Amino acid sequence: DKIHHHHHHENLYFQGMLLHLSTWQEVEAYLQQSKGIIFPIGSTEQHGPTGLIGTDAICAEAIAAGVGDATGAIVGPTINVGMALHHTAFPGTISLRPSTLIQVVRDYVTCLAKAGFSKFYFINGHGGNIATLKAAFSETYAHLEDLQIANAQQVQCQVANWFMCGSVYKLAKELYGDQEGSHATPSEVALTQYVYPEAIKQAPLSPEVASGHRIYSAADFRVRYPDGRMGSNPGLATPEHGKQFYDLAVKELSNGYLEFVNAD
Template identity: 25%
Template sequence: MKSIWMHEHTREEIGEFARNGGAVLVALAATEQHGPHLPVHTDTLIAGRVAELAVRGAGAEVPLLLAPVLPIGCSEHHLSFGGTISLSPMTYFQVLRDIGESLVKDGFRKIIFLNGHGGNEPMMQQVANDLAVRHPIWTAAASYWSLARESLQHIEASEVGPVPGHAGGFETSAVMALAPELVREDRIGTSHPERDWIFAGPAGAFVGRHGELTGCDGFTDAPVRATADKGRLYVQTIADSVSGWLVRTVQAMERGEQSV
């Protein structure tokens, strides 16, 4: 294919790719406040870059296209800070469902969602499940931090703060690497209250408190240890993990088709 991006192909090229068993990845992001020091498209910047690197890597082994990144998500808990565009949970669910239904009509039988914002995850998982119930297709869905958890632990990414956190050391490092001109280093907080209750449960568990779902002042930890070098390492590590998952997932789908 001339490009990994779905939107750079014609309708005929996309249809042929889908009919021949190609998969499509839909990256989910958000436009929301990220404290006083990061741009509101932080999640879109990171998720888009991770998805692009991952698809370029995986595309050498499996047929895969990348749909346009969805830059608006479910960010209700950020609205009080301003600088946020959000879809309500039910609206977002329907948006994802409509995207999936469109891809099915385009001929795709392998649809994969990759998430880059925590508020999107429940609806994403449900839509992926529903699509596979309604249609004779394969679906998969995951958030990038879940796919890269072990790899990020191996490189000790948590040294800068919770991973992924929100506008803390991890995300600030990533933006410093991807778009340093957008980081307001003069507004980086040097301290943040400890909130141990967030980590009271196992990975994947949710613990919330009214008014503090985004941390204090809209970020979860002080990003004083963030650096561009760390950000480059984090982004590449995540992309490598996602790429490996995409290859394994698409190949498993292909084996499943052959066994029917």
């Protein structure tokens, strides 16, 4: 079909309750039952010769829709561009400054907190967002207090990193060992291959890959990691492994969301 030609993506994403496919009256009705909302947050950045530039957004989005569906949580629109400053020496990377992302998060949370949302669960696909997100939460809490927003004291934000789930790390170790690496990992590439089997990329991977975890300026990054991979053999990925990572991430983060939303 002309409009809808990513069928695996559509099966995974168009489940549960998306904010974008709801009316304001439906959101008002939802808010009688729950004050929780899930934001998928990723990145638009290089993922080596074979990785999708959207990998982090693709992963977060797909898992978030799954968690929404499993928990009854409303799922907001995906934050597609985050803090990816160190990947800007590769073309197609888009990044905000940390200071810009903090203001974006502040704006999102303030609008929704005024409506009565108080449990904000960010399902994150990009390690580089973690620090800025946590900073943004702190900035946001102080802003809500300064505004004397009615529910300010109740408003809570948490980031859940799908790639830090214990079930996910344990499977990646079992399948890929010390070739999982830190960026353009076979686990995340596996997941993208499951969501978008039509976009599986064929490209050579140099047989030696730069290792280590050191990340400074964009210019330094590309010198250290010339093809953009850190330590990783994404050629071990399969869409079958991808489904496994999807199912583990959704199960573990459904429990995590429910523990969050049900906590005081």
